[PDB]
């Protein structure tokens, strides 16, 4: 006996918890381009020196499908999207009886309409007719001379996005507040979520960019080894599966249409930017994929799924069965306009048990959108005048169920990205924040002065 208790301020202990974070991005575009939708007009700049410390002898258990960093990311981008659209031109007097006719094809695919209507002019007393153009599926028939209707006027409002807003995703660091720390896993093969042995305590995450993609993730991060397979629950086929590419496949998307900005003043100052007549031929949008480079990626995936999924059953790769055309096609915002390249061409290959040609995909463009199934308010995308090219790295895949097969064999995973939060999980699978507790009591024979 005769042991006393002693206090220690500065002890390294923590408990699993989550709180608010903040943005961090250095000097990116500022003057040459500004008014970004993600970095806002000003965010807390990150320091070039990276805050990193390697932790030894520690094996903290992470979690990815129960991590709340993706939850705050999901909800931050949503409130950020609306904050950058509230001060922009509303498009309410654009819901008037549209009388359209098919475009000039030498009296003979269609996909677009040379439509018109009459709107408000600078004077509310006077009205003005202007002929613009619209895309298919942005409009659906009402009930000779075709008379059409904006599809959104049936369900929700509409507000045009601002023309000087940059929709390019830039790296947005999520750094921890004071008294907290973001633990990153350094173990390469982090199957599922368990006890990651190689941990690093970093203050600022890496360059995370908010790629708004569907079925196929682009510009993601990865750190070697077999193409990693992550699933909240491997036995349940109903759950979604995130897949990471040991090497990215360089893809290029573009639209050949040469459009023109037609500004028409609605009301006092606001102007509605629509499509004029398309100059220099009309062509369909497409995304190329390296055919030889894709056959190796589908082979590496099926190899590591094999020891994961019995390694005895048959591979059945099909198009995204069911769903909606925006949730089953590779939907993504690129170059201002919103592409929806046809996925069904990639997963036609089936491989089981033991200058150069490139596969391409037909794509269409949509101007009316309200992503992540937000039915509150929709937005019109002004057609970007001139040329468009995307040319991004693809690094991830989103695959979903394969029916309720009762035992037997034969199954895979067809593409579905029904949830937008999973897209951010491909970057935050290794991060978890903890509540640092600097207080720690321990006994030791040790006492201060007797009387004082």
């Amino acid at each position: 006996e005769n042991l006393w208790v002693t206090v220690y301020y500065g002890v390294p202990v923590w408990k699993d918890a989550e709180t608010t974070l903040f943005c961090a991005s250095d000097a990116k575009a500022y003057e040459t381009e500004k008014h970004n939708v993600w970095a806002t007009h000003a965010c807390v700049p990150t320091d070039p020196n990276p805050q990193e410390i390697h932790l030894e002898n520690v094996t903290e258990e992470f979690n990815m499908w129960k991590n709340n960093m993706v939850e705050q990311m999901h909800t931050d981008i949503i409130s950020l999207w609306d904050q950058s659209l509230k001060p922009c031109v509303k498009l309410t007097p654009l819901c008037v009886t549209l009388q359209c006719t098919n475009v000039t094809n030498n009296i003979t695919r269609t996909e677009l309409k040379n439509c018109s209507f009459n709107m408000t002019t600078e004077l509310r007393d006077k009205k003005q007719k202007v002929y613009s153009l619209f895309y298919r599926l942005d409009v659906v028939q009402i009930n000779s001379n075709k008379e059409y209707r904006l599809i959104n006027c049936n369900t929700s409002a509409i507000t045009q996005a601002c023309p000087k807003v940059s929709f390019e995703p830039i790296p947005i660091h999520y750094c921890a507040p004071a008294g907290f720390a973001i633990l990153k896993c350094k173990d390469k093969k982090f199957n599922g979520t368990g006890p990651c042995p190689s941990v690093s305590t970093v203050q600022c995450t890496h360059g995370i960019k908010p790629v708004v993609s569907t079925q196929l993730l682009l510009n993601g991060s990865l750190a070697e080894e077999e193409v990693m397979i992550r699933s909240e629950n491997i036995t349940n086929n109903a759950k979604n599966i995130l897949v990471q590419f040991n090497t990215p496949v360089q893809i290029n998307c573009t639209r050949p249409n040469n459009n023109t900005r037609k500004s028409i003043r609605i009301g006092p100052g606001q102007a509605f930017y629509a499509t004029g007549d398309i100059i220099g031929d009309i062509r369909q949008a497409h995304c190329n994929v390296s055919k030889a480079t894709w056959n190796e990626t589908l082979g590496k995936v099926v190899k590591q799924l094999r020891k994961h999924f019995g390694n005895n059953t048959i591979i059945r790769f099909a198009n995204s069965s069911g769903g909606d055309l925006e949730v089953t096609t590779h939907s993504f915002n690129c170059g201002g306009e919103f592409f929806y390249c046809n996925t069904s061409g990639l997963f036609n290959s089936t491989w089981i048990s033991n200058s150069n040609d490139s596969i391409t995909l037909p794509c269409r463009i949509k101007q009316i959108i309200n992503m992540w199934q937000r039915i509150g308010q929709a937005m019109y995308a002004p057609p970007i005048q001139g040329v468009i090219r995307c040319v991004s790295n693809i690094t991830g895949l989103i695959l979903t169920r394969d029916g309720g097969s009762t035992n037997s064999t034969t199954e895979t995973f067809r593409p579905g990205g029904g949830d937008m939060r999973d897209n951010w999980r491909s970057e935050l699978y290794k991060y978890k924040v903890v509540k640092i507790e600097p207080l720690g009591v321990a006994p030791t024979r040790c006492k201060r002065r007797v009387v004082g």
């Binding site: 006393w4 410390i53 004071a178 203050q203 201060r448």
Partner: protein, 134 residues
């Protein structure tokens, strides 16, 4: 050892450099750094800076009523109760991380705090009644 360097090391080695851990936490995060400033990031910055000081000051208020206003390590005149841990002198300090110890007293950690205020300060600062001037 730049920060949490001894998170996995022994409680003794972690006790050799616990200054570092204390320095970075209050200061850390580089908080210091269209015309509006009502954005979603600024409001997440301000409240993240409020708990920064309101979790620091939540802890610094405890050391002040323990005689440890400006000391990282006080030896306190409170006797250790055997029920809290049965392990000997070199049994815990040469074997457990601070992580393991935090869960081993987390049950009766509040019982310690209440007793620390009584003997080290509630009685000690009173014991000078007969000794201050006499």
């Amino acid at each position: 050892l730049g920060f949490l360097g001894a998170a996995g090391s022994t409680m003794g080695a972690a006790s050799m450099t616990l200054t570092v851990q204390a320095r970075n936490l209050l200061s850390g995060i580089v908080q210091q750094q269209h015309l509006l400033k009502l954005t979603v990031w600024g409001i997440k910055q301000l409240q993240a800076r409020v708990l920064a000081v309101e979790r620091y000051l939540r802890d610094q208020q405890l050391l002040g009523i323990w005689g440890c206003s400006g000391k990282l390590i006080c030896c306190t005149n409170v006797p250790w109760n055997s029920s809290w841990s049965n392990r000997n002198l070199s049994e815990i300090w040469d074997n457990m991380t601070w992580l393991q110890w935090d869960k081993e007293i987390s049950n009766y950690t509040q019982i310690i705090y209440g007793l620390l205020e009584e003997s080290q300060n509630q009685q000690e600062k009173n014991e000078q009644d007969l000794l201050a001037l006499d």
